[PDB]
Amino acid sequence: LPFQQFGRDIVDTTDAVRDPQTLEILDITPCSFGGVSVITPGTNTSNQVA
Amino acid sequence: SKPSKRSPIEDLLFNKVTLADAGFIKQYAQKFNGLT
Ligand SMILES: *[C@@H]1O[C@H](CO)[C@@H](O[C@@H]2O[C@H](CO)[C@@H](O)[C@H](O)[C@H]2NC(C)=O)[C@H](O)[C@H]1NC(C)=O
Ligand SMILES: *[C@@H]1O[C@H](CO)[C@@H](O)[C@H](O)[C@H]1NC(C)=O
Incomplete structure (x- = not known):
């Protein structure tokens, strides 16, 4: 709407902004993240990991 | 006849x-906030 500056999701987090100069609406996607798992044969066999 | 049998x-x-x-569809909000 003409007066809305940003938007939110169902969990009250920010997901969009209004550019202060161009008034373009921009979605905010979080930067990629995730867990890291290390797969190892065990240090008593080999030191190669994935 | 159907996929997945x-x-x-x-x-x-x-x-x-x-x-x-x-969240949203992802091929692998989408990852919430530190929650996977
Ligand atoms: C102020 O905001 C206006 C937009 O409301 C800016 O004008 C635009 O500037 C871009 C280039 O950066 C042009 O391509 C657009 O056509 C312009 N639109 C209009 C309506 O003028 C303006 O540059 C901003 N800054 C100043 C100092 O006016
Ligand atoms: C990974 O990105 C490529 C980009 O071309 C896409 O074609 C592919 O389907 C994507 N796969 C997954 C699992 O996201």
Whole structure:
């Protein structure tokens, strides 16, 4: 709407902004993240990991 | 004749139960905030 500056999701987090100069609406996607798992044969066999 | 080779009943069971996470479709909000 003409007066809305940003938007939110169902969990009250920010997901969009209004550019202060161009008034373009921009979605905010979080930067990629995730867990890291290390797969190892065990240090008593080999030191190669994935 | 159907992909996944599930029975008509299994197909119905998957069609009745749906996932509705507060996120968006991802191929692998989408990852919430530190929650995977
Ligand atoms: C002020 O905001 C206006 C937009 O409301 C800016 O004007 C635009 O500038 C871009 C280039 O950066 C042009 O391509 C657009 O056509 C312009 N639109 C209009 C309506 O003028 C303006 O540059 C901003 N800054 C100043 C100092 O006016
Ligand atoms: C990974 O990105 C490529 C980009 O072309 C896309 O074609 C592919 O389907 C993507 N796969 C997954 C699992 O996201």
